[PDB]
Design a protein around this ligand. Structure first.
Ligand SMILES: Cn1ccc2c(CN3CCCC3)cc(-c3ccc4c(c3)CN([C@H]3CCC(=O)NC3=O)C4=O)nc21
Ligand SMILES: [Zn+2]
Ligand SMILES: [Zn+2]
Lengths: 27, 109
């Protein structure tokens, strides 16, 4: 359901593209 | 007590210093290591506001045994603030608290 995980905080995403943006925003 | 706000947007009060408690031996705030080598100085508070949760509780690599975490983000700007912790059994006290990462909050604690 949410297979993509942020390695900094553990946030999970259904769309990998939203993971990529989320990681960027940790900066 | 001093209000703590999102460092990124500084639009919301997330918690106040009167919410701070020590859950274990390591004082109210200590450094913890996540599975990938990120170090979060995590402050434990009983109650927090103006946060949104992502997903469902997990016990994976929990820093506080007996609790599950859920990622918590600023409701305004979506910046990572910390995690809500929820007991996985009834004998835990408190049944829930928040672990806020120092680098996400202003003022600096
Ligand atoms: C990169 N990556 C790929 C999958 C994955 C998964 C999903 N797992 C499900 C079973 C096996 C994998 C989780 C994580 C992951 C990333 C960052 C954190 C965590 C977990 C847990 N966590 C805190 C939360 C607060 C705390 O107490 N301790 C912690 O360590 C993180 O900051 N990263 C993943
Ligand atoms: Zn993240
Ligand atoms: Zn914010």
């Amino acid at each position: 359901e949410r297979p993509f995980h942020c390695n900094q905080c553990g946030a999970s995403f259904t769309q990998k593209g939203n993971l990529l943006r989320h990681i960027k925003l940790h900066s | 007590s001093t209000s703590l706000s999102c460092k990124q947007c500084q639009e919301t009060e997330i918690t106040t210093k009167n919410e701070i408690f020590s859950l274990s031996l390591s004082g109210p705030m200590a450094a913890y290591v996540n599975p990938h080598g990120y170090v979060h100085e995590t402050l434990t508070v009983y109650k927090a506001s103006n946060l949104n949760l992502i997903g469902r509780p997990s016990t994976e690599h929990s820093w506080f045994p007996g609790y599950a975490w859920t990622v918590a983000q600023c409701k305004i700007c979506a910046s990572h603030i910390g995690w809500k912790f929820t007991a996985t059994k009834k004998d835990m006290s408190p049944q829930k608290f928040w672990g806020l990462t120092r680098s996400a909050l202003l003022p600096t604690i």
